[PDB]
Design a protein around this nucleic acid. Structure first.
Ligand SMILES: [Cl-]
Ligand SMILES: [Cl-]
Ligand SMILES: [Cl-]
Ligand SMILES: [Cl-]
Ligand SMILES: [Mn+2]
Ligand SMILES: [Mn+2]
Ligand SMILES: [Mn+2]
Ligand SMILES: [Mn+2]
Ligand SMILES: [Mn+2]
Ligand SMILES: [Mn+2]
Ligand SMILES: [Mn+2]
Ligand SMILES: [Mn+2]
Ligand SMILES: [Mn+2]
Ligand SMILES: [Mn+2]
Lengths: 94, 99, 85, 108, 92, 104, 77, 97
DNA sequence: CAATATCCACCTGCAGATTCTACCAAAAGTGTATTTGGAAACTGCTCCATCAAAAGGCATGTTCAGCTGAATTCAGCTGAACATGCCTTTTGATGGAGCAGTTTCCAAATACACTTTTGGTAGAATCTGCAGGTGGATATTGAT
DNA sequence: ATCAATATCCACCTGCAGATTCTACCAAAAGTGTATTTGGAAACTGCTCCATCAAAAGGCATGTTCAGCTGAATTCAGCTGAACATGCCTTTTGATGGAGCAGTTTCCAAATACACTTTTGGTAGAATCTGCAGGTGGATATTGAT
């Protein structure tokens, strides 16, 4: 009865990879959850516009990529763009 | 002596203290009322989801601590070390908050 | 609320405002900053809230939820993390 | 039928490539959402998450703490030029500000 | 095949100041405006109805939205004008 | 029989309805939505135009151009607020000088 | 090439902004900011060009860029 | 002969340029600065005429804005001459830096 | 007081630009049908709104002496105002064609409608990082 | 140049709130077969955009002076910052109703679908003009002095 979603479960998996023996508080995970969302929306919206701008009707990976580039700052983008282009090929390689 | 610190010693002391911490600096209850009062004035009989009052206070204080910096830089920009309304008014203007 | 809510702005004591300015880096403070703070503060609040309650009325509720504020703050350009995610 | 394996696991991601794809559709951003979009976006999101986490984990390490808290996240962001800029108009609850006293204020 | 509000802005420019004209650039400015405000009001509404698990943007949303983007007095007239104009639609 | 003639407006009520649909705002659009909106657009337009008019005329000029808009805008508190972050191409700034700069 | 912005110009501008007395180091400082402005707004602008798979930065390309920059511009789209 | 006391013409120039709305930076050199800059992003680029117009309107307008805020900062510090310092205080507060 | 320059209404003219005027591929608008919100209405089930002590953290006042902020000279340079001196921006068109935009088709995408397998979220156990608390050192500060 | 008179630091401890772990139910991601619809190949196309070439005043770039501006350096009244008393008022718990909040049925009022008909709205072409673009001629401030 009432199912609340979040990224807490994933945020955590990642935490354990960078710092195997470090923990994160409730309020902290709160902050983190907001983050993924602010950014999720930021990019999605940015991609959305990019598509309307190009009178196209679907968001490909390509759009998400210019969005990230238009949105994210310098080095963060590079890394994001690489990490991004990577996962997809690794995916489309069925 | 009775002992006594020079003017500013404790001031710089506090700054260091309050920058090393993260608690809100305003008393919860008063804030509570101020918000309810103001909200009472927009739409009568409004109930407040605790955390909401908690969020407003987190946003308010974060906001001022921020205005106080830009304020402080305006005081220093005019060879002063004591912030004055004059200063807050210039930061607000330049910020666009009021122009 | 029973007892009529009045003059609660002066409930932002001088010591508290001074505290906020310390975390702010301010060393010395003119005596007229205080009332000046309440003035700025009150406006900030009236705004965040005014929009917040709008969201509350749109959803047809008698309660101002944490999200209502989080949304208010967002459109105000003061995005806040820690309550709406 | 072949035993399912979450799209995420295929992309070797820790982030829910399926949950992002949905959010994209139920979000109205576009008339239709591609197939790698949720994989890409998830990749970017998961990336950034880890970055914050890295700097944060250290911020806690420094302070002699095993458990991260908002303070540490404020510290991470405000000290990393980039994360700072990405989240420049963002205020973080219970996080405080960076310790910093203007030099003209200090003693003789 | 190139849309704009160039026509309407003008017909309107004629209700208030019938005997007055408008530049080309000035007319350009006026477009950017409608589109801009169109954009904002739609977005808030969209968000509004989205925050409220609603799958349809109505007039109620467009209203709140207005009541969020426009300044005191500006907001008042918009809403009147909007309500007015709408009530008339429904009424046959 | 134009939805606009019904709401008694000038702006394209139908079009605004189309632009909403094909804008990726929501799943479906109410019937009086484009109505309510177009009249807001109708409103805000007239409001500005009216003021640019005066502005235009105030210079013994009949055709409204940029400088007049930038005048009806930055001179009006609400419009200036609303367009608080918009720059009007070829509009200039308001004649204004800090008294602290005037002669002896 | 930035010097293309002659000392006079930078003054004509300052004057429209109501400046009376101008320091001399300002002119340099003003070419600094300006340079950054265009860079940031064109860096974004060309991205809309390139996403649109085109070889021409269009007036709208600037218009959008300028928008996300928060410098909305009425009069070009 | 005749010579205007300093500051009197400056005023003349303010009152004048504020009244007009035409651009102040010479177009040709602007366009080059732009074209040149664009080069660091993509080679053999084509700039839609007007996009250049847009670019300048965008810039000049931005600058004048900054100058006002700058002037406020110079005035605030009891002065009347804008120093690179006021330009920084202004920007530092706008959030630009 | 008047000499200089700077300016501001009073005036006519052509044309670089409005405005209409004249027709047509696209949406608007019109049923008739089809599918669907989300506005009713009831129910628990949470949170929210008080309230009622205890104390003891903190405000509020009240000195009291330190040094900021505000005032006031001086003059060593900035930068404005003004002329000369050319060097480029700034109009004027013309080619030549690199290019944004348009269609025809269609293989390769994403849509859907069920039907199956899980990957999470909600709670209920077990923990186990630290807030407090206390107390010996440094580490400053500010009188003599 | 030393000594008190206070913070400012850091190491231990030690219960418990808050964090993991440990399970069970489901809305949801997959795994299939069909359904439909992108947007790219390429085949053209006027449209601007990019070069040159040729002009001219129109700005832009140096030099001269020095008019006041911006910075020092002193002062001094007077506005705080730094300390106590005094004793409100804000925490901190922690029980208790009950507004509301959210699920959990359906049930019309509406919104979406597709299929034709009817009109605009928009894109060049035809008549108009609102304002530059110069030209004067009183004034309008600047500014140097019996
Ligand atoms: Cl894709
Ligand atoms: Cl003041
Ligand atoms: Cl509706
Ligand atoms: Cl400087
Ligand atoms: Mn690691
Ligand atoms: Mn239903
Ligand atoms: Mn001083
Ligand atoms: Mn399982
Ligand atoms: Mn401790
Ligand atoms: Mn001298
Ligand atoms: Mn009830
Ligand atoms: Mn059908
Ligand atoms: Mn027609
Ligand atoms: Mn003229």
């Amino acid at each position: 009865r009432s199912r609340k979603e979040s990224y807490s479960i994933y945020v955590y998996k990642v935490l354990k990879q960078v710092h195997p023996d470090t923990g994160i508080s409730s309020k902290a995970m709160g902050i983190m959850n907001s983050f993924v969302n602010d950014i999720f929306e930021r990019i999605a919206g940015e991609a959305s516009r990019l598509a309307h701008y190009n009178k196209r009707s679907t968001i490909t990976s390509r759009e998400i990529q210019t969005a990230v580039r238009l949105l994210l700052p310098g080095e963060l983008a590079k890394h994001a763009v690489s990490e991004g282009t990577k996962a997809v090929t690794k995916y489309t390689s069925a | 002596k009775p002992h006594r610190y020079r003017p500013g010693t404790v001031a710089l002391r506090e700054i260091r203290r309050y920058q090393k911490s993260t608690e809100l600096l305003i008393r919860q209850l008063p804030f509570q009322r101020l918000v309810r009062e103001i909200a009472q004035d927009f739409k009568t009989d409004l109930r407040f989801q605790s955390s909401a009052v908690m969020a407003l206070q987190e946003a308010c204080e974060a906001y001022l601590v921020g205005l106080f910096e830009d304020t402080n830089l305006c005081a220093i920009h005019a060879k002063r070390v004591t912030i004055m309304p004059k200063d807050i008014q210039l930061a607000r203007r330049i910020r666009g908050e009021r122009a | 609320h029973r007892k009529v809510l009045r003059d609660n702005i002066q409930g932002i004591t001088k010591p508290a405002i001074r505290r906020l300015a310390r975390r702010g880096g301010v060393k010395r403070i003119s005596g007229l900053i205080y009332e000046e703070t309440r003035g700025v503060l009150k406006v900030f609040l009236e705004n965040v809230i005014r929009d917040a309650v709008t969201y509350t009325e749109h959803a047809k509720r008698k309660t101002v939820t944490a999200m209502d504020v989080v949304y208010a703050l967002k459109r105000q350009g003061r995005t806040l993390y820690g309550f709406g995610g | 039928r072949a035993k399912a394996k979450t799209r995420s696991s295929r992309a070797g991601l820790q982030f829910p490539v399926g949950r992002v794809h949905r959010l994209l559709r139920k979000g109205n951003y576009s008339e239709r959402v591609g197939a790698g979009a949720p994989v890409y976006l998830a990749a970017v999101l998961e990336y950034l998450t880890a970055e914050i986490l890295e700097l944060a984990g250290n911020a806690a390490r420094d302070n002699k703490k095993t458990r991260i808290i908002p303070r540490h996240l404020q510290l991470a962001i405000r000290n990393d030029e980039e994360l700072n800029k990405l989240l420049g108009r963002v205020t973080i609850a219970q996080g405080g500000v960076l310790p910093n006293i203007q030099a003209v204020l200090l003693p003789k």
